[PDB]
Design an enzyme around this catalytic site. Structure first.
Site, short mmCIF file in Angstrom:
data_model
loop_
_atom_site.label_atom_id
_atom_site.label_comp_id
_atom_site.label_asym_id
_atom_site.label_seq_id
_atom_site.Cartn_x
_atom_site.Cartn_y
_atom_site.Cartn_z
N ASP A 121 0.83 -1.21 0.00
CA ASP A 121 0.00 0.00 0.00
C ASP A 121 0.86 1.25 0.00
O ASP A 121 0.53 2.24 0.64
CB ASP A 121 -0.88 0.05 1.25
CG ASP A 121 -1.64 -1.21 1.46
OD1 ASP A 121 -2.26 -1.67 0.47
OD2 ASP A 121 -1.61 -1.74 2.60
N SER A 144 2.72 6.67 0.99
CA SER A 144 1.80 5.86 1.76
C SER A 144 0.44 6.06 1.14
O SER A 144 -0.13 7.15 1.22
CB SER A 144 1.76 6.32 3.21
OG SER A 144 0.76 5.61 3.92
N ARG A 145 -0.08 5.01 0.49
CA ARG A 145 -1.38 5.08 -0.17
C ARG A 145 -2.48 5.25 0.87
O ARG A 145 -3.50 5.89 0.61
CB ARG A 145 -1.62 3.86 -1.07
CG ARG A 145 -0.91 3.91 -2.44
CD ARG A 145 -0.77 2.52 -3.07
NE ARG A 145 -2.00 1.74 -2.95
CZ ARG A 145 -2.88 1.56 -3.93
NH1 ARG A 145 -2.66 2.10 -5.13
NH2 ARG A 145 -3.98 0.83 -3.73
N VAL A 146 -2.25 4.70 2.06
CA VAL A 146 -3.16 4.90 3.19
C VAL A 146 -3.23 6.37 3.60
O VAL A 146 -4.30 6.90 3.91
CB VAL A 146 -2.72 4.05 4.40
CG1 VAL A 146 -3.35 4.59 5.68
CG2 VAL A 146 -3.08 2.61 4.17
#
Lengths: 227, 165, 231
Positions: free
Chosen positions: B4, B29-31
């Site tokens: 992610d 950070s895709r989160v």
């Protein structure tokens, strides 16, 4: 042989980035100056003295012009070169000349090696407009006007081509071939000429700069691949 | 394409002694700030932009000439940010301390301060809070959004003024 | 000598790359996989089986200096890749430095060690080394600067930290015992304690005044002042 000769490469690249973008400006800026120069001509033309008649001969005053915030090749290190060669024979006295250092690059020179300097005009400007040296000009006259100056002088970086510009020293206050606004504008005349020349000198060093990067880069690149 | 997000470690950086040798540019950070307390999610927000700009003007390294424009306003204060990013091995910093430290530089409290002086000014800013302004620190440990700003800026300035640059 | 005798043994493997490549031949002969790049299915395993025995035990010891050539010059190749996984430092002999006089011709910038932490060699040593590194790096930047901007417009400080680079570059060479029988200096062994100190003084500017050929082929910094009394 596969790491920080690429640092050398990327850095030399970046330098290349900026010297050309500043080559753009050297001519962007210091051609405008030519406009804001040949405009003076007009009023520069409308033409025993208060004392600005040939007299002798003690304490003399210099006014040496240089870039502040410079990146113009030699054209700044070879006019200091010239005040510091010509005063070498005009200094067997401790009268100590005194210079009016315009421009920060000549300024600092003069406060590292004692000279000394009675005035150091802050930050040049590139216009340079009307309210800018009507101090050091005005007060460089003011020191001939009673009377600590028997002669004034600038060290002008005269503008021939944009490819060349020659270290020149003119003499201002003791005139030649109520109204000394002439002197004040004479200092315009040079302060204005001194500008063109600097950037005149600046793009020339920037092209050369760009080029020199390319070349040098094209040397470095052989090392990028062949161990 | 499985994880992610990724933290990239530039080799160049690591042999420039820069540590961690993180390449924040390409690293993500895709989160995102979904996993990031309000305080940090805030002070960081600006910081993403901050050294993004400093990335471009980076090229004009040892040539401080542009004067007043997108100059030592961006560039000079970018050099400062890159210092608070640096961080010794095995020295995890508690969020709270991270957050003050970041907020300090990001709000220009380092701008009057040097650049060879940023690292210590941080180390010593925090040690100053841990023993004095813990009120502010624990405030961030409890639903940490930092606030009481200006009191924050004051508390900083009461350590600020440099007095040792 | 490590396990019995408990010492800190060396062990040089000349072309460890040839070793993994012998691995590939045998594997083929045994009719194995092989990888899509030709190598054994067990490249890494076999490397690990060798490398893993080279270690500092509690009786302490073995430090392997491994010559890695690989003709192809691709170091992304599986063979070099695997070997690299084990490396803890690289020493880079540089033809340029050799034909320059520096005779442990080790590239100061190219060579690296994972134990160059302040944790391993202490803050001082670490800071002196990161100190020497930046100077030598800066030296290269300025190198390219004068290339494309001349020595014109060279900060008195910049111009200054160029002289210290030239001295450092020289104080990095040293006479070998093994070379005695030709040069005969004679040899020099220099404790890190003294190396660190040496370069620390150069960096602090404690010897700018000394001639730059005074650091070439000396041991300690003490020996360099001795020789600043010639020419």
């Amino acid at each position: 042989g596969m790491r920080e000769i690429k640092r050398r490469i990327r850095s030399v690249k970046n330098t290349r980035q900026i010297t050309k973008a500043m080559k753009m400006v050297a001519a962007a800026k210091l051609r405008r100056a030519q406009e804001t120069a040949e405009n003076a001509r007009p009023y520069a033309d409308k033409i025993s003295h208060p004392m600005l008649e040939a007299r002798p001969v003690k304490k003399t005053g210099y006014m040496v012009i240089t870039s502040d915030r410079g990146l113009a090749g030699p054209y700044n290190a070879n006019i200091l070169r010239l005040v510091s060669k010509t005063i070498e024979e005009r200094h067997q006295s401790k009268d100590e000349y005194v210079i009016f250092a315009v421009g920060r690059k000549g300024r600092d020179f003069f406060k590292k090696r004692g000279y000394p300097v009675v005035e150091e005009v802050t930050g040049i400007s590139d216009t340079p407009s009307l309210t800018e040296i009507q101090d050091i000009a005005q007060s460089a006259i003011g020191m001939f006007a009673d009377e600590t100056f028997d002669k004034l002088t600038i060290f002008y970086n005269e503008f021939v081509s944009p490819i060349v510009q020659r270290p020149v020293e003119k003499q201002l206050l003791p005139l030649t071939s109520l109204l000394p606004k002439y002197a004040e504008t004479l200092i315009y005349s040079a302060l204005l000429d001194a500008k063109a020349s600097e950037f005149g000198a600046r793009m020339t060093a920037m092209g050369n700069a760009t080029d020199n990067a390319t070349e040098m880069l094209e040397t470095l690149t052989l090392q990028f691949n062949r161990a | 394409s499985i994880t992610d997000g990724q933290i990239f470690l530039e080799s160049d950086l690591f042999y420039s002694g820069v540590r961690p040798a993180v390449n924040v540019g390409i690293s993500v950070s895709r989160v995102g700030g979904a996993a990031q307390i309000k305080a940090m999610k805030k002070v960081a927000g600006t910081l993403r932009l901050d050294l993004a700009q400093y990335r471009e003007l980076q090229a004009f390294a040892q040539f401080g000439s542009d004067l007043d424009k997108a100059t030592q306003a961006k560039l000079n204060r970018g050099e400062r940010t890159v210092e608070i990013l640096k961080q010794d091995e095995h020295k995890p910093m508690p969020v709270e301390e991270q957050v003050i430290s970041i907020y300090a530089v990001t709000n220009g409290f380092m701008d009057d301060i040097p650049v060879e002086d940023v690292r210590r000014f941080e180390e010593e800013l925090l040690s100053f809070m841990r023993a004095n302004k813990d009120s502010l620190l624990d405030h961030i440990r409890q639903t940490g959004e930092l606030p009481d700003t200006k009191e924050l800026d004051a508390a900083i300035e009461e350590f600020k003024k440099g007095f040792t640059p | 000598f490590r396990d019995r005798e408990g010492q800190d043994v060396l062990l040089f493997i000349d072309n460890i790359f040839r070793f993994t490549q012998a691995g590939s031949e045998v594997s083929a002969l045994l009719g194995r996989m092989p990888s899509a790049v030709g190598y054994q299915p067990t490249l890494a395993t076999e490397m690990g089986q060798l490398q893993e025995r080279i270690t500092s035990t509690k009786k302490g010891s073995i430090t392997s200096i491994q010559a890695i050539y690989v003709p192809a010059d691709d170091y992304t190749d599986p063979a070099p890749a695997t070997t690299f996984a084990h490396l803890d430092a690289t020493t880079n002999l540089e033809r340029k430095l050799a034909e320059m006089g520096i005779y442990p011709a080790v590239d100061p910038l190219a060579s690296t060690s994972r134990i160059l932490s302040p944790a391993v060699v202490g803050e001082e040593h670490y800071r002196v080394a990161r100190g020497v590194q930046q100077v030598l790096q800066r030296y290269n930047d300025l190198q390219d600067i004068i290339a494309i901007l001349g020595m014109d417009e060279l900060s008195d400080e910049d111009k200054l930290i160029v002289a210290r680079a030239r001295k450092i570059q020289r104080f990095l060479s040293q006479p070998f015992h093994v070379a005695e029988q030709f040069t005969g200096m004679p040899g020099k062994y220099v404790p890190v304690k003294e190396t660190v100190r040496g370069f620390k003084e150069i960096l602090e500017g404690k010897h700018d005044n000394l001639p730059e050929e005074a650091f070439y082929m000396v041991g300690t910094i003490d020996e360099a002042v001795e020789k600043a009394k010639k020419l």
